[PDB]
Amino acid sequence: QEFEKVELTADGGVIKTILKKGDEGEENIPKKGNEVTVHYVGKLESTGKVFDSSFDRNVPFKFHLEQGEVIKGWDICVSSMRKNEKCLVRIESMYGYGDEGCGESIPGNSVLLFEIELLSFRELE
Numbered sequence: 535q536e537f538e539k540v541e542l543t544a545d546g547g548v549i550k551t552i553l554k555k556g557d558e559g560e561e562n563i564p565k566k567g568n569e570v571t572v573h574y575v576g577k578l579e580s581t582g583k584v585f586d587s588s589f590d591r592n593v594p595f596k597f598h599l600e601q602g603e604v605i606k607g608w609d610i611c612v613s614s615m616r617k618n619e620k621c622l623v624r625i626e627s628m629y630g631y632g633d634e635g636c637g638e639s640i641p642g643n644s645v646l647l648f649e650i651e652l653l654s655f656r657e658l659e
C-alpha cells in the first residue's frame with residue numbers, strides 16, 4: 535500500500551491515513567495531558583469545502599491531549615501519532631460535533647476530514 539490506513543475506532547468513526555511516518559518509539563508519542571503542537575487543515579466532506587486553514591502553514595495550533603479540549607476524534611487521532619507524523623483523519627459526527635454541528639459551515643451529522651502534522655509535545659509540571 536502507498537499509505538498505512540489505521541482504523542482507530544472499531545465502528546469506523548475515526549480512520550487515519552498516515553501520509554508521512556513519524557519517529558519510532560513510545561517516547562515519541564504524546565501522552566494524556568501533554569501540550570501538543572500541530573499544524574492542521576479541516577475540510578467538510580459533504581460540500582468538499584475547506585473550513586479552516588489558519589493553522590496549516592506558519593501558525594501552530596496547541597492543545598492539551600485527552601483533556602476535554604477538542605473533539606473526540608482529535609484526541610483519538612493525536613494520541614496515536616508519532617512526532618513528525620503527518621496524517622489524514624476522517625471523523626464521523628459521533629466523534630466530531632454530533633447533532634449540534636459548529637458555526638455557520640458545519641451542520642449536524644457532518645463528516646470532517648483533517649490533515650494533521652504533529653510537530654512536538656511536552657509534559658506539564
Ligand SMILES: CO[C@H]1C[C@@H]2CC[C@@H](C)[C@@](O)(O2)C(=O)C(=O)N2CCCC[C@H]2C(=O)O[C@H]([C@H](C)C[C@@H]2CC[C@@H](O)[C@H](OC)C2)CC(=O)[C@H](C)/C=C(\C)[C@@H](O)[C@@H](OC)C(=O)[C@H](C)C[C@H](C)/C=C/C=C/C=C/1C
Nearest residue numbers: 574575576585586595597602603604605606608636637640
Ligand atoms: C479561531 O479558531 C478557533 C478554532 C476553530 C473553531 C471552529 C472549528 C470548526 C475549527 O475551525 O476550529 C476546527 O477546525 C476544529 O474543528 N477544531 C480546531 C482544531 C482542534 C479540533 C477542532 C476542535 O475541537 O475545536 C474546538 C471546538 C470548536 C470546541 C470544543 C469541542 C470539544 C468540547 O469538549 C469542548 O467543550 C468545552 C469545545 C475548539 C478548540 O480547539 C479550542 C482551542 C478549545 C476550546 C474552545 C475549549 O476546549 C475551551 O474549553 C473551555 C478551552 O479550554 C480553551 C482552550 C479556552 C480558550 C480561552 C479558548 C480558545 C479558543 C480558540 C479557538 C480557535 C483557535
